[PDB]
Amino acid sequence: RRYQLDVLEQAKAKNTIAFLETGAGKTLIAILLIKSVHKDLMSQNRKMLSVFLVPKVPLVYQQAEVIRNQTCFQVGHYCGEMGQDFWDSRRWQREFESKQVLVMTAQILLNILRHSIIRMETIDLLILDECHHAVKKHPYSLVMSEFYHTTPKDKRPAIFGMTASPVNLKGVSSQVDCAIKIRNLETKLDSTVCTIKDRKELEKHVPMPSEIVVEYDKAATMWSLHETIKQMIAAVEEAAQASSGAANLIHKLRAINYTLAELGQWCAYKVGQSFLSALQSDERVNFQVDVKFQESYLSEVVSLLQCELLEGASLIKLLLKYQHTADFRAIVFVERVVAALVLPKVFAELPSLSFIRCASMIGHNNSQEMKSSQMQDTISKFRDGHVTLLVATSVAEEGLDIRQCNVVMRFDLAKTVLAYIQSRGRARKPGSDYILMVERGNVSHAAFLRNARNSEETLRKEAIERTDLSHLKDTSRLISIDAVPGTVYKVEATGAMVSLNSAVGLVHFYCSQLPGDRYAILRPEFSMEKHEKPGGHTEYSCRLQLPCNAPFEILEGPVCSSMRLAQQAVCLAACKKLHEMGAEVCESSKLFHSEFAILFGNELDAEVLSMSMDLYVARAMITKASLAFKGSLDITENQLSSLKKFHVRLMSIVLDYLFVPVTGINWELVEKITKTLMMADGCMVAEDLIGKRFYVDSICYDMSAETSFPRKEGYLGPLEYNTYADYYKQKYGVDLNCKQQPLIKGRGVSYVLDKTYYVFLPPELCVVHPLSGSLIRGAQRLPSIMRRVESMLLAVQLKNLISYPIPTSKILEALTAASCQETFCYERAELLGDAYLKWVVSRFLFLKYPQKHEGQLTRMRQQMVSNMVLYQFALVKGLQSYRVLSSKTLADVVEALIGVYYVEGGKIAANHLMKWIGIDFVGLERALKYEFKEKGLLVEAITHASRPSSGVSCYQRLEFVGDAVLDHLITRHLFFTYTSLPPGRLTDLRAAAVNNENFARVAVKHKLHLYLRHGSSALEKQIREFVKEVQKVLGDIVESIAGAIFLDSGKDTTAAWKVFQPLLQPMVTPETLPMHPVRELQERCQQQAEGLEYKASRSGNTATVEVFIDGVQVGVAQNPQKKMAQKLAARNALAAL
RNA sequence: GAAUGAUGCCUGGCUCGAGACCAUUCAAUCUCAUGAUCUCAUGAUUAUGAGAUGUGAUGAUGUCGGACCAGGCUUCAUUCCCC
């Protein structure tokens, strides 16, 4: 109607406070105005960004309904209550595209006010409710404190709020006139009030039900001696207090008192029955024993009283007049929720009319209630008509769409009569009447009804515009507006309050450090001391205790007059501290055992060249050597050009810088082969090659071409070619001119001697291809030598290193890829380089930060041990010059370089290449069988992330460094271990090295769980289990000792290395791998590996698995179902087979 | 010209089993409270939000082996060949 348009004018005009109950859908008109300013292309098109802020999340689901019900212009929502620490950044980055309206609660938006995000998020527009609550304790006031100065482009110029839904500010005697606290709040949020001005724009279609009072209950309440009974049971409770979760049961007693008081004793019997159900659940779940004792105490007292009140077993006729054609919509309003829970039982019980309830969400430790979703389910059931008859009953009572409820029954709710007027607008009145069953007993409800009357008086008073606004000027300052001025003056107050809130939240955040032993550890804590100074100068010593990771924040100070203010001041100390912290070619000849020779401009260096190199074939080894007799021997380059054409002819058509067999060079042979009836001669074919190419070792004259093709096998009857000239005639149509010549014993050059002797060739029927078979040997043996040559020229480039103690003859093996060309791998020096990598990165890292954080510098190490960084060190070298899919083992080759260049000289030259590319006490002492000097680092190692009431330091850093050092040390041993196993088996042994369990096994070789001091007893209980296993944190404190002696040794490994190695060694050669079962099973049944499901049941055995080749056995243990079930199955199988 | 088997190696994806680590989910925990009510007041009582921790499993991802098929190369036996 019209008043919507009027407040459209007033609100689009200026910042606006409206005070109208239901506003005829105030949020509707808010949506309309926001769509108006949206369709308007604003100055900044995203500055609009208006959110209706509520804290009520089922109401947020109503806004899901609403904001998808409207706003073709795009809008968003939250589930809320989610992990959104940095999520909000990309939430902005996506909301600027796709979410003009996003929904969130207040406190999240408060954290968004923190850290000075971009520019107050370009908001400039807002909708808000619960604005009456926006007071000193409330967040919204603290928002408007920093938002009072709407300076930057006026980031928050116009303000729109809703105080209509909660009108119970408290103070009708202080606010009999129209504006008292209203002036105060409208000066707070800087938004102008607009009142309803009249009821002419209301009540035309907004009827208000007449209020009907009742006297005393239709409850019986006819047992007054049970009041004295409950007074004696109150004395029982006083004994329970003098004893001192007892208080919850105490309040349960108070509750059942209220039930028996207000609704008779039969109802309190039903309440005792619900107490039996709740108390049965209490006796079930509760493991605490004093409280379970008092649960049994509850059962005896409640069985006494409730069994009396079963023999003892309101407003009913009110319900009954409304029962004929039951109410389409019914609302009942009471506070005590457990009574509301016990109603439908009684209502099915005596009058046989079904009833339903809506619970509240506040509860503790799996409290039986409707969840928020379950409340929405109940609401949807209420949207169904049958459950609407069942009735709706709650205590939250806000933000639902329930219309035209004929019966209003605020049964004994009078604290928020103004909120009831909310619930009165909730329903349009079709001749409906509100009903107020108040007991005629206890007449202070006369006072409550005149308070209601004064409430409508004050509503009528504010309905007159400015009835106490422009009226009081000085007396308003003597009433409350000098008590409520623009108090924003104190600048350290807002820094102090922000420091309070943020420092407690950051206390929580740094409490989320990494406890490990327990899910939550109380690392920050405090105690309070009344530091009242005689004279009225009360002070408060706030004693502040911190974790070890918090260095310099312990404060025990009578710093401020109030206790919470002293905590605010210690938060100020903390916030300052976290501002700080957190915030003529050389002739050289080749010999082997016309000899060969290379021709290159380069002169081979004697040291760089291997003295002899080896060759390995199926027959035998052949080794070779070279010698530079004539330095700069000169041959004519044109003859070189012709014979080079012949050399590439050898490569190209014969084999299909340059090598030479030298007799004194046999140039004439080179040129001869450059160009290149009858009787046979055996001497010409004593060593030859015959082009179609075959080897000619020897002949046979006894077998001639006229003789038969001997085929010993006669099953299929293969064609025995009666002459070999007839064999040639049958296949190629060829006959020999003189078939009497001997037959060539054939020898095959292609890539048991009887099959070789099978081939027989005719001399003329073959065009010789001219080479001696020994030179055939040499020529086909040339290519591996060329691979050797390219190896030694790479050795020319690389033996020419930056620095090199020894020649890089084994770097030749390091350069070659693992398992490539049958040659050796590089993995010993590789894993050695990896171990040194970890050791030296720990070295330089602690060189950087002895002020480090442990896991943070762990992240920094992992950053340094990122493969791509070492890939870039390779790039700034370029071992490429001696196609990477970005996932390559080239980093491992670099590691090989690192290890081998340690091996060539010292560690130090290896570090040069790195810079070239990259950059109880005596009891546990004798338990380790050792001696110790500085017990401070020992204390540092024994300190645990949990320590009983004491904190000095942490062992996590020492664990880190001893970890890296023993990586180095174990790797150094294992590559001093010259077993030279399969690299798979080398991988197995290094993996067997890395296991915290066997480090804990060393710890119980010294039994340090008896020696460790620790705050947590459940952690010791977990350790005592693991000790009973052997007759987790133990290996960790072992590494802390390792690091501690690394400090003691001045970063030396050898001294404590000597101590650890004998106890280290003798277990390693037995494999005894705990991943026997699944590895050995999936490998022992490659063809048929089948599997049965386990995770259906918890701890226990279920191992009738469908494996076939190994067989099917079941093995028994306490918890084998994770691992060792298949191991016990293999045990029973090998017992079976 | 080739192939067959057996023979080990290596590569791809797929899968199963352990590490690590990321997200989800539901419970829970602990703070932070905020309104109202008595209490001169403290204090007590009642309604309702924020997180963070978080149990389990889920989905991943990154290492590490399995198998599995798909393949490249080679020995040990032959069959066959090429003038």
Side-chain angles (χ1 to χ4, degrees):
Chain A
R1 68 188 74 185
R2 41 170 194 276
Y3 195 47
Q4 293 84 316
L5 321 169
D6 314 339
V7 297
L8 267 160
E9 302 153 353
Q10 200 271 332
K12 170 247 299 176
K14 201 179 63 168
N15 45 16
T16 279
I17 300 304
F19 213 86
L20 172 56
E21 203 260 328
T22 67
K26 262 153 176 211
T27 41
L28 171 63
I29 315 302
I31 282 188
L32 290 162
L33 189 142
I34 291 313
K35 288 204 306 305
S36 75
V37 306
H38 186 290
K39 178 259 294 178
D40 157 76
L41 298 179
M42 275 291 172
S43 316
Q44 177 205 331
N45 202 359
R46 277 285 311 185
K47 89 189 196 65
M48 318 172 172
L49 259 177
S50 199
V51 179
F52 181 29
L53 187 78
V54 310
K56 312 284 99 171
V57 175
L59 274 67
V60 179
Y61 304 135
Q62 315 299 320
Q63 319 321 315
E65 180 268 328
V66 158
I67 207 66
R68 302 294 193 267
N69 194 3
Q70 299 308 296
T71 70
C72 69
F73 310 135
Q74 62 273 26
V75 288
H77 260 268
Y78 282 173
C79 180
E81 71 268 359
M82 276 165 65
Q84 278 160 270
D85 311 339
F86 194 58
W87 299 58
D88 305 336
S89 52
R90 62 199 70 188
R91 279 159 200 273
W92 323 134
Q93 291 139 36
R94 298 165 282 169
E95 80 185 1
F96 303 147
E97 183 264 299
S98 45
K99 298 182 291 298
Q100 301 323 291
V101 190
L102 191 43
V103 193
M104 78 305 295
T105 88
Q107 319 85 327
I108 308 147
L109 189 58
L110 155 70
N111 319 324
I112 297 321
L113 182 139
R114 310 206 157 85
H115 292 326
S116 67
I117 307 298
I118 333 173
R119 197 57 265 178
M120 305 303 106
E121 299 90 22
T122 79
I123 299 303
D124 314 280
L125 289 92
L126 197 74
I127 313 96
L128 186 47
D129 54 343
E130 307 102 9
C131 285
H132 115 252
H133 296 100
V135 303
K136 49 182 188 301
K137 289 180 280 178
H138 200 276
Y140 298 167
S141 49
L142 319 163
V143 188
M144 201 44 201
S145 62
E146 303 91 51
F147 277 177
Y148 178 72
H149 39 273
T150 171
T151 68
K153 195 255 287 179
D154 281 30
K155 261 314 163 190
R156 58 276 185 188
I159 309 101
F160 304 115
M162 300 188 174
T163 152
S165 179
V167 239
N168 197 27
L169 30 106
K170 167 56 182 297
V172 73
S173 176
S174 175
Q175 265 233 73
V176 256
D177 349 275
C178 143
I180 299 256
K181 340 266 200 357
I182 307 299
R183 278 158 86 166
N184 301 347
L185 55 92
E186 77 204 6
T187 45
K188 286 200 288 189
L189 91 173
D190 296 333
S191 182
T192 320
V193 63
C194 55
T195 80
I196 73 172
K197 315 295 187 302
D198 41 15
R199 286 298 181 89
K200 73 162 177 54
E201 50 244 25
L202 214 67
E203 306 298 324
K204 303 191 298 294
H205 315 89
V206 210
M208 150 239 347
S210 131
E211 123 100 70
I212 278 303
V213 75
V214 190
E215 63 97 22
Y216 212 87
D217 277 7
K218 308 196 193 59
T221 67
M222 55 205 290
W223 306 267
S224 196
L225 61 99
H226 293 76
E227 309 167 355
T228 318
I229 297 181
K230 95 177 164 184
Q231 286 142 36
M232 304 312 116
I233 296 174
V236 169
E237 177 183 82
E238 290 143 29
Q241 304 146 7
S243 86
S244 89
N248 332 316
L249 322 163
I250 279 152
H251 307 138
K252 286 179 196 60
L253 181 149
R254 303 196 299 130
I256 181 75
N257 300 333
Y258 310 145
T259 65
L260 67 94
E262 66 100 26
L263 251 281
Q265 303 280 351
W266 34 273
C267 83
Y269 142 72
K270 328 271 183 314
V271 184
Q273 168 54 65
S274 48
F275 269 133
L276 312 171
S277 48
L279 177 55
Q280 280 157 319
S281 43
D282 295 329
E283 279 279 342
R284 293 156 212 160
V285 185
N286 191 6
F287 321 105
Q288 267 61 243
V289 301
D290 194 301
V291 193
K292 197 190 297 303
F293 165 69
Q294 272 307 311
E295 278 151 27
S296 43
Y297 198 98
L298 204 179
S299 54
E300 47 87 10
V301 175
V302 82
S303 47
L304 171 141
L305 192 63
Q306 175 266 329
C307 85
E308 299 168 0
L309 312 184
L310 167 55
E311 175 275 349
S314 180
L315 68 152
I316 312 110
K317 322 314 157 298
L318 179 151
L319 321 169
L320 286 162
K321 98 222 194 234
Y322 264 117
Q323 202 263 300
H324 173 267
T325 65
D327 11 77
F328 268 176
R329 336 261 275 159
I331 28 162
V332 171
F333 299 137
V334 194
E335 190 270 324
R336 282 290 91 202
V337 305
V338 294
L341 186 43
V342 87
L343 306 184
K345 337 186 173 184
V346 195
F347 300 166
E349 176 257 339
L350 270 177
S352 51
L353 255 324
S354 16
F355 190 87
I356 236 267
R357 210 254 329 217
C358 274
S360 164
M361 80 303 296
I362 51 172
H364 50 87
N365 273 309
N366 288 297
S367 67
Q368 195 278 296
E369 70 204 355
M370 291 184 181
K371 312 299 111 179
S372 158
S373 64
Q374 192 177 343
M375 294 145 170
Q376 318 320 311
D377 302 301
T378 314
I379 293 155
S380 48
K381 287 145 43 64
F382 186 91
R383 274 165 266 161
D384 322 333
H386 161 72
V387 195
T388 333
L389 139 98
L390 264 60
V391 171
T393 41
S394 162
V395 77
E397 302 142 343
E398 293 328 294
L400 199 39
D401 43 356
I402 298 175
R403 293 86 46 197
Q404 291 98 42
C405 345
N406 55 95
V407 35
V408 207
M409 232 350 267
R410 200 120 174 137
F411 181 75
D412 300 333
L413 285 191
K415 299 211 305 174
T416 51
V417 182
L418 293 142
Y420 148 73
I421 292 293
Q422 170 51 242
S423 76
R424 163 173 277 172
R426 249 274 232 87
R428 288 312 111 103
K429 159 227 180 90
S432 106
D433 253 38
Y434 158 72
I435 334 134
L436 179 39
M437 172 69 83
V438 70
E439 275 187 347
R440 169 229 43 82
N442 194 359
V443 281
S444 165
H445 46 82
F448 303 162
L449 185 52
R450 57 90 191 170
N451 276 130
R453 274 163 282 180
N454 210 5
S455 73
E456 296 108 16
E457 179 256 10
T458 285
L459 235 157
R460 247 37 248 148
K461 264 288 215 0
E462 71 95 33
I464 312 149
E465 185 69 28
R466 298 194 143 262
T467 341
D468 208 60
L469 242 148
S470 44
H471 281 228
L472 303 197
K473 355 259 346 110
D474 52 337
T475 42
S476 47
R477 308 171 305 102
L478 307 165
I479 275 209
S480 82
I481 85 167
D482 200 6
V484 182
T487 321
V488 284
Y489 318 114
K490 192 174 166 334
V491 55
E492 280 298 322
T494 195
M497 179 261 314
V498 164
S499 174
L500 184 159
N501 323 307
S502 301
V504 173
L506 267 285
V507 155
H508 198 90
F509 161 73
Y510 283 97
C511 194
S512 62
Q513 196 266 340
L514 43 114
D517 26 66
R518 294 197 193 241
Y519 63 89
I521 282 275
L522 256 343
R523 302 160 177 255
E525 206 57 30
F526 52 90
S527 66
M528 304 73 66
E529 194 270 341
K530 175 86 165 183
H531 195 275
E532 200 279 329
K533 284 316 260 105
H537 194 36
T538 314
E539 266 295 316
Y540 261 107
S541 314
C542 63
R543 290 78 63 91
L544 185 65
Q545 173 54 46
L546 274 306
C548 295
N549 197 5
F552 186 25
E553 299 89 340
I554 312 287
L555 182 52
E556 283 66 38
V559 58
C560 199
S561 280
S562 155
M563 186 172 65
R564 280 80 61 196
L565 267 298
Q567 311 324 111
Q568 182 164 357
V570 80
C571 284
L572 274 157
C575 80
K576 179 260 294 179
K577 288 150 185 186
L578 268 298
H579 274 296
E580 302 163 351
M581 277 78 82
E584 286 276 293
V585 287
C586 277
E587 171 261 313
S588 287
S589 53
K590 313 304 154 57
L591 62 95
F592 35 83
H593 44 287
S594 280
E595 290 216 315
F596 262 78
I598 197 58
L599 279 304
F600 211 105
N602 308 356
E603 151 75 272
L604 24 111
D605 217 328
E607 24 125 346
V608 316
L609 239 269
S610 49
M611 184 248 129
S612 240
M613 178 51 209
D614 291 291
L615 281 201
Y616 302 99
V617 302
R619 203 255 197 184
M621 179 272 305
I622 306 183
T623 174
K624 48 207 158 289
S626 338
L627 227 150
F629 295 90
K630 300 197 205 74
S632 70
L633 171 60
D634 43 355
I635 319 290
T636 64
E637 76 268 52
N638 44 3
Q639 164 196 50
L640 292 182
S641 317
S642 46
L643 304 184
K644 179 249 286 182
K645 291 166 204 104
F646 171 57
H647 152 80
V648 306
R649 176 172 188 260
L650 293 182
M651 319 189 312
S652 306
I653 195 172
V654 191
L655 193 138
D656 306 82
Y657 302 89
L658 261 66
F659 271 149
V660 56
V662 189
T663 311
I665 322 185
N666 43 74
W667 285 285
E668 71 298 332
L669 306 184
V670 190
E671 284 109 24
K672 273 169 225 157
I673 315 161
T674 309
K675 276 84 73 180
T676 61
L677 53 85
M678 61 302 295
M679 282 69 65
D681 169 72
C683 321
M684 287 153 209
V685 304
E687 208 203 18
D688 215 352
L689 178 91
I690 34 199
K692 164 219 258 261
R693 90 270 136 253
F694 230 56
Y695 180 45
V696 194
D697 196 76
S698 311
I699 61 171
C700 47
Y701 193 75
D702 52 336
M703 198 75 68
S704 279
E706 295 102 349
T707 53
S708 158
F709 155 66
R711 185 68 176 173
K712 68 183 183 294
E713 187 260 4
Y715 312 137
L716 310 97
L719 202 155
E720 288 88 11
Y721 295 89
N722 304 319
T723 84
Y724 306 98
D726 134 86
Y727 160 68
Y728 270 69
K729 213 56 193 180
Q730 281 219 199
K731 249 163 112 200
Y732 337 103
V734 180
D735 269 331
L736 183 43
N737 200 348
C738 169
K739 304 158 177 45
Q740 293 81 16
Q741 49 212 44
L743 298 190
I744 300 295
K745 289 194 166 64
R747 298 296 299 278
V749 309
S750 44
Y751 308 121
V752 310
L753 283 174
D754 47 359
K755 266 213 287 196
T756 65
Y757 300 143
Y758 278 169
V759 201
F760 276 150
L761 305 94
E764 184 56 88
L765 255 36
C766 217
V767 202
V768 58
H769 219 275
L771 199 56
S772 69
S774 278
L775 190 50
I776 294 273
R777 307 171 220 229
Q780 189 44 249
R781 282 172 312 193
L782 293 193
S784 88
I785 319 302
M786 191 41 70
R787 309 291 180 92
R788 209 55 193 81
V789 158
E790 72 197 6
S791 154
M792 296 327 286
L793 257 177
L794 282 170
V796 159
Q797 281 103 45
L798 289 160
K799 286 179 186 294
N800 190 353
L801 193 55
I802 312 103
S803 88
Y804 39 98
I806 88 168
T808 78
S809 51
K810 298 162 289 299
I811 284 89
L812 314 180
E813 281 83 353
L815 187 55
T816 61
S819 310
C820 193
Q821 253 82 243
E822 98 180 358
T823 202
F824 322 109
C825 32
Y826 51 86
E827 316 319 305
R828 318 272 298 257
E830 165 263 335
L831 174 51
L832 211 52
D834 190 13
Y836 204 105
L837 151 68
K838 302 300 299 191
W839 184 76
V840 79
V841 74
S842 64
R843 185 64 263 131
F844 278 177
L845 265 187
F846 206 92
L847 283 192
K848 297 171 193 69
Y849 318 97
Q851 65 276 5
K852 51 187 286 294
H853 176 273
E854 210 268 352
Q856 179 40 69
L857 264 297
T858 314
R859 303 149 91 265
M860 304 284 294
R861 173 169 86 173
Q862 300 149 359
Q863 158 264 314
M864 285 304 300
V865 194
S866 315
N867 62 277
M868 279 296 151
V869 193
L870 323 160
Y871 153 84
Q872 292 282 330
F873 303 148
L875 288 171
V876 308
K877 166 60 98 178
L879 202 82
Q880 33 238 67
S881 68
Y882 306 111
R883 245 175 124 134
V884 150
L885 317 156
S886 160
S887 317
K888 207 77 61 165
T889 73
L890 100 136
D892 328 340
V893 182
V894 181
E895 296 164 45
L897 318 171
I898 298 150
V900 70
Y901 196 67
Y902 154 70
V903 172
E904 281 213 329
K907 299 186 279 188
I908 300 96
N911 304 319
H912 145 58
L913 254 297
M914 294 163 209
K915 298 279 181 177
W916 170 266
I917 51 168
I919 295 290
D920 276 337
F921 326 104
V922 285
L924 55 93
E925 195 57 41
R926 85 186 70 101
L928 264 293
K929 279 80 56 176
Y930 187 57
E931 192 272 333
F932 211 71
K933 176 58 203 73
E934 174 46 53
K935 254 73 175 180
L937 311 179
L938 184 155
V939 159
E940 174 177 8
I942 300 299
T943 50
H944 173 55
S946 89
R947 280 308 304 280
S949 189
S950 68
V952 175
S953 83
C954 69
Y955 72 106
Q956 280 70 7
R957 315 165 57 186
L958 317 188
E959 184 284 330
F960 192 89
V961 60
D963 157 77
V965 168
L966 268 295
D967 159 69
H968 184 198
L969 278 172
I970 285 166
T971 307
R972 192 180 72 189
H973 160 70
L974 287 174
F975 292 136
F976 289 160
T977 303
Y978 295 146
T979 41
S980 317
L981 300 189
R985 296 186 61 246
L986 299 166
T987 310
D988 303 305
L989 58 90
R990 63 91 183 170
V994 49
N995 167 42
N996 201 5
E997 208 273 342
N998 54 45
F999 313 144
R1001 296 251 201 180
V1002 182
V1004 287
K1005 273 158 43 190
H1006 318 293
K1007 293 295 188 185
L1008 259 280
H1009 67 290
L1010 314 164
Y1011 292 110
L1012 192 65
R1013 277 86 69 195
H1014 45 278
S1016 163
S1017 88
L1019 149 109
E1020 197 37 64
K1021 173 247 314 134
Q1022 290 142 32
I1023 291 277
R1024 181 226 52 245
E1025 308 153 10
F1026 216 90
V1027 159
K1028 287 182 289 185
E1029 301 171 27
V1030 291
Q1031 305 296 341
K1032 33 180 83 173
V1033 185
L1034 263 184
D1036 299 334
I1037 62 172
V1038 159
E1039 288 118 17
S1040 64
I1041 305 305
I1045 314 164
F1046 199 60
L1047 317 182
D1048 300 318
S1049 47
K1051 317 307 153 290
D1052 170 74
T1053 77
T1054 72
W1057 178 230
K1058 296 145 200 155
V1059 189
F1060 198 89
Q1061 53 205 43
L1063 52 88
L1064 175 57
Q1065 177 48 233
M1067 273 67 64
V1068 308
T1069 309
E1071 284 80 5
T1072 66
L1073 66 156
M1075 209 182 293
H1076 275 109
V1078 57
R1079 295 299 142 265
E1080 268 73 349
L1081 194 143
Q1082 295 172 351
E1083 284 150 355
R1084 85 194 149 143
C1085 241
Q1086 328 220 314
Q1087 305 312 300
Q1088 273 121 257
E1090 276 83 18
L1092 177 141
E1093 283 50 49
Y1094 312 132
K1095 206 46 172 158
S1097 85
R1098 277 306 161 160
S1099 196
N1101 51 22
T1102 168
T1104 61
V1105 180
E1106 304 86 55
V1107 254
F1108 301 125
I1109 316 165
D1110 63 86
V1112 180
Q1113 290 283 331
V1114 195
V1116 57
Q1118 179 281 310
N1119 188 284
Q1121 197 155 352
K1122 186 176 177 180
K1123 293 289 279 291
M1124 298 295 191
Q1126 321 104 47
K1127 175 62 170 65
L1128 289 157
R1131 282 149 149 157
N1132 307 324
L1134 274 292
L1137 66 99

